[PDB]
């Protein structure tokens, strides 16, 4: 009742009765820049969310901008050595890898700037919902530096290796329907991206926990290997998930016609 | 004259004089659901199609719907153990991997529902032709289960890892021009997808057998490795294919101007 | 002052004062077909461009067509053995791999035909700028042969494995906005693709050399491995690039508000 | 007859506990592997698991396990590069079905295990050699690059650089030195066939699924980054270790 | 207390030079690894680097290093396939943090290093065995497929085919033969604990960053094509070899 | 002069059968590898195949093969992390051209084969050691992480965990123990140079293409999943095994 949401500071957490937890970056006056303290909180939260029973996460940023990326001021002031910063990057990965492979569905509800490490963070979620104020960029080059948080991997998977290279090499900005179509977000709304993210999250939370776990962890792992080896692994995932007792009621519903068929959109 | 098309039951096969074989899933009253028997026939057919001389395959489903996926009723009734079903999934892979890496051009002529394992099957073909009635989905989650047939691999290659995840996580349906543009099918027609698939197949069958074999097997293998190692392999594929005696007539046609040049579309 | 641009023949080279070097395929009467001599010049140029101080490359073709691909006449006449041609393909890779992983930003300014090995060459650049006369194809099958220059890898990364297969299997041609949207080029202009490429190149040359080097070499390498291992490598790239002394002035500019913020497009 | 009939170049003997002895049977040609024999290996190893075979003891009739690819057939066929590339894919189909098929294969070696014969031996999970057994890739000296995935499997057995040494120089290994190198896990002073049968009978008394996973998943996981193989392994362990037959054995 | 308190199944002793002795402490159950012990290993190895631990000497209390996965707990829990798949992921979390965590781990082995116990030992960078130490994956005979990534790490240690042999037959290795096979880099006639401490003290006197790279980057690079690992290595070398502390040592 | 001139730190001797002796020639500095020497290795190994070199015997002038990276130059240059990362990429360019270049390289070792010197030796296909030869990665003790892809190649030669042991502890190997470990395929009681020449002359008498494939494809296939390497191998076999020169040899 407070076990999941207590003890944090840079993050604000709200656990709903159906197991959907709203995780809000809460440093709006700094445009939710990710400093080392905030990254450690993300590591802590995503390291235990699955075992804590969280069914889905709606990730958002307080204020008008999702996330401005690496806290550039903390970085500049720290005057870090290469090894000091390499270690900081490894902490980002511990958090973001836990998000991607952890097994808990994450839906990012975007607004305003989703830039640099902020796009890296949005990319670590399974689904992204953008609104009319949302824009994307990897402006790192302007600051004289490289990106991080696995953006070189995830954004390449989202929009194509060559478009990812274009974004960081030129600082090109994308927004609106063009951004959605490019692959920066699966959903675009005329209204509240938060409300749309909550709708998706609630539906996800009503599905089977094991099935969601597999979807949210196995697919990313299988992209990392040869498709011929991935197929063998997929068969074992299917073996466990498809024979689970909890799905028999749904299988029976299909056989007795009480369950809905798959129809084209209206 | 009957060697290629005899001995089957769930599949109907029609071998045309130019070596194009039409393979039709033939359980329309069950919406061509893939039960274990049907999968074994696909294993048998694609395991020997290249050596039998088949030049191209037009894969289609009898009735109004291409394929409804895993036979859910057989699955539910069998009340399978995890290992029993893992083994069933391996049979699906034997068939679908033979389709993808086998070297025989496969063009799927889609109509209606292309869902779950049915999309997995369509994804195992090189080319997909959709019509105005065609719609796509990975509704597995609704049934409480995971997908199979390598859909996590192939559909991710077709539309992007994150869109593949979106489809199975949310049950999102795609159709029409939007589906084509997303990458679910390379061709969309206002008319008969079968006639369009046959047109593509006939043109393919008129090209060189070795060249088609390489195109239909080597490209998928090269995506499975580092691009630096793939390049070395590509050079050996090019070495064998590009120096084949059968292509010299075409090379000569280009040199003497009797062959057509590459021009923009009209 | 002539060290970078002297000693070539099939290539014309022009080094601008800001370190941008214009590399022009110069066999317009042969539509810039890539024969073995031209490939060796590309090997020589891209093998040393980074150490020579070249900041960006604008790659283009003299005449109305970017590049017609493999010199088919030289190939036909040579009546090569499989090993002879496999060796020729390895020379293409030495050049194109040096382009992709070499660390020097390359922007291709396309016009007319970008076909077969010509698309392979355009694909080896980081950015592609197309104009209204530009069209793309992998017509190799028509000539009875396979593609090369890593097109099976790079074009698959650009437009999707299945669209790459479609292009070579059917000889399908793409042009205009449709080509740009498919992923064949990140930029499309109503005017001069060369002028647009120069604008991009000049901006790129004004960024930090180490940062550009990382962007132009590390991202391609990281796509070749599992994302979990790639993340560790990304942290070391970030460690070196993000703590470089040359970027502190830019970081300071952001902290004191003298640097521009990231805003949506107008 | 369902398991043993249908082969001309292979001799099969199915034992009552499910161990099937598969004997290469062209002793007059030292069991050289021609396209027809390769196709029989494709057929046998594609169906053995589903036909109920619990383990296979693979041996060569005569004093020599296998003299390699049939060079007489190769020379007579005068194959083009593409014709031979296709022949190589058939060799891989047979050997891949052996390695990833899930049916434990124990090779009982004797005499020459050379060229494609070493590729065949390497496709088994276990190898038992005797005091007459020797290994080599002699074809390199005559301009041939060994096929059957020997470059893949022998590198895993003895190390990439020792594999390069064998094909580049034709170096021969035998006796205890070969066993210690990694060419065979078992070396006997007596019958390699009898030792292989001892191993096969014990393996056949274990659970079908457990042997299936051991004989297919490990090879697949070795092709992956260890960080992704870990995840796949959890699902393999999840299915194998909670099977009812295993619980009974714990009890 | 910041480093040593917080564990029930592990006994910890932090030495003044930063070497931390981590002792598996359920001697009465031969240090069988139950879910609770695995979670403690996850916690310790997730934080050791940031807590300042310079090297770890891992040992088992009693005469036996580790008897493997706790089969008593497994049998009693009567786990479903998904329940056990989740347990396996926890084992991987602990062992992956050990292998890629960047803190040098030296295992001081004694007696039985079996099943999941061999998986644990393999997760260390270095292993020191004594004259009583033996290695085996006996669980296969009772229908169990070894977890903890043993199929991954033991294949790197002794070769894929020797690893397949161990799990398929339950074959036991000990003494000099085991060391030569690759099961342990060091074998002693005396105390394996004292030899491990000697190794750990020397390692602890080296630079933190250099040890960190050695103990995380090599495993990551082995998961890549050598052509891409080369590029990553250049950046590792770039950071490690230009550190101020290293320059001082050159001088 | 086309093959042998153009180098200052290397001494070259092209024999009539195409074997080229490449001698590291800074004996006064124990052949330490400075940036200039590395660039010469890049040049030689980038062109050897196309210049017609049939095989290379690589040795170090003096009693020691190679003392490693030139630490004097490193200390004086006071390199930044990016400066040194770039130096590392040059080392990889040279060693990658050696490993995948397709020209057989046989290293004749003597004395110290240490640090970057072991990385260089590992870049050859074959290594011949004598009774004075020893191997070590001593730089780790002074805070340096070995470059030149030693973590990649030495892991393939002796196993990832033995490679980690060498860099983490500075452990030295020599004599028969080093050969058995996998540091060298050949050990001689006499001249390692003469034994390397014997090997090189035999290799040079084989077909150019066959040696080219052996010396480039095997390393590339080891970077792939075995299931995809199989397919690539079929095309390598298709081209190599149907060459006219090979047919003649069969006949
Ligand atoms: C693991 S490697 C990762 C590499 C990276 O991620 S590099 C980071 C790339 N990101 C950027 O370049 C985005 C920088 N920020 C902006 O462009 C703007 O602040 C945005 C468009 C996000 C919002 O514009 P606004 O006009 O609404 O706000 P600003 O006036 O620019 O900033 C408001 C406050 O947020 C702070 N802030 C705004 N991004 C800040 C920030 N990334 N850091 C550290 N303080 C920030 C900014 O400094 C200021 O602090 P303060 O009032 O105390 O001086
Ligand atoms: C390797 S892991 C793979 C995982 C999967 O692939 S999971 C499968 C996901 N697929 C689905 O959820 C699609 C289920 N089917 C439907 O939604 C509809 O049947 C569709 C849209 C395909 C067609 O709708 P229709 O209204 O035209 O037909 P239905 O009335 O729903 O079904 C007609 C007959 O086909 C049967 N059928 C229709 N899909 C059937 C089916 N997937 N199985 C087994 N009988 C089926 C359905 O049960 C019924 O049988 P019968 O008249 O004897 O009771
Ligand atoms: C590593 S594996 C790689 C595999 C490949 O890359 S296969 C190559 C696939 N490319 C093609 O099939 C394109 C062939 N060329 C054309 O289709 C046209 O020439 C294009 C559309 C580029 C231009 O059409 P044009 O009507 O403007 O020119 P043409 O009259 O067709 O050709 C003009 C000159 O360029 C020559 N040329 C035009 N492509 C030539 C060419 N690819 N070779 C060798 N001479 C050429 C053509 O032969 C002729 O030479 P010449 O006047 O001395 O006879
Ligand atoms: C996937 S790429 C792989 C490439 C390769 O494997 S190339 C081949 C590699 N193998 C060899 O080079 C082994 C060559 N043969 C031998 O070493 C001997 O035959 C061995 C040691 C196995 C047995 O010696 P024997 O003195 O007991 O018998 P031979 O007199 O040498 O051979 C007896 C018969 O077997 C035949 N044979 C013996 N290897 C034959 C063969 N690889 N082919 C095709 N007929 C053969 C040989 O031709 C002869 O046929 P015939 O009675 O009609 O004259
Ligand atoms: C990631 S998948 C991995 C799969 C596995 O690892 S499966 C297990 C593999 N390991 C084994 O099969 C080793 C089995 N045990 C032994 O071989 C012996 O216990 C050894 C040689 C280690 C020590 O022999 P001892 O004669 O000195 O002691 P035991 O009398 O055999 O065992 C003493 C106590 O430890 C317990 N124990 C001893 N292994 C126990 C155990 N793996 N679990 C759970 N209680 C155990 C054993 O049950 C008993 O508990 P208790 O006093 O309550 O009866
Ligand atoms: C890709 S990252 C790789 C990292 C590394 O490789 S770091 C270096 C690893 N190698 C070593 O630590 C070996 C250090 N040297 C030795 O062990 C000895 O020199 C050996 C055993 C090779 C020969 O001993 P000697 O007693 O016969 O000769 P020395 O008196 O030790 O050295 C003779 C000359 O070679 C020089 N030298 C000897 N290694 C030199 C060197 N690695 N650099 C730069 N000058 C050197 C040494 O400085 C000296 O120069 P000088 O006459 O001007 O004083």
Numbering used by the authors:
A (entry chain B), B (entry chain B), C (entry chain B): 2 to 267
D (entry chain A), E (entry chain A), F (entry chain A): 3 to 253
Lines quoted from the article behind this entry:
The crystal structure of wild-type R. pomeroyi DmdD free enzyme has been determined at 1.5 Å resolution by the molecular replacement method. To determine the structure of DmdD in complex with its substrate, we created the catalytically inactive E121A mutant (see below). Crystals of this mutant were soaked with MTA-CoA or MMPA-CoA, and the structures of the two complexes were determined at 1.8 Å resolution. Good-quality electron density was observed for both MTA-CoA molecules in the crystal. However, there are differences in their binding modes in the two molecules of DmdD. In the first molecule (molecule 1 in Fig. 3A), the entire MTA-CoA molecule is inserted into a deep active site pocket on the surface of DmdD (to be referred to as binding mode A), formed primarily by residues in one monomer (α2, α3, α10, β5-α2 loop, and β9-α5 loop) but also with contributions from the CTD (α10, α11 and the C-terminal loop) of a neighboring monomer of the trimer. The phosphate groups of CoA are recognized by ionic interactions with Lys31, Arg32, and His66. Moreover, the C-terminal loop of the neighboring monomer provides three additional side chains, Lys258′, Arg262′ and Arg264′, for ionic interactions with the phosphate groups. For example, the long loop at the C-terminus of DmdD is observed only in one of the two monomers in the MTA-CoA complex, where it is involved in binding the substrate. In addition, the C-terminal loop and part of helix α11′ of the neighboring monomer are not ordered in the active site for binding mode B, which leaves the phosphate groups of CoA exposed to the solvent. The carbonyl oxygen of MTA is hydrogen-bonded to the main-chain amides of Leu71 and Gly118, the oxyanion hole of this enzyme.
The enzyme DmdD catalyzes the last step of the MeSH pathway, the hydration and hydrolysis of MTA-CoA. DmdD belongs to the crotonase superfamily of enzymes, homologous to the equivalent enzyme in the fatty acid β-oxidation pathway. The structure of the DmdD monomer contains two domains. Consistent with the gel-filtration data, DmdD is a hexamer in the crystal, which is also similar to the architecture of canonical crotonases.
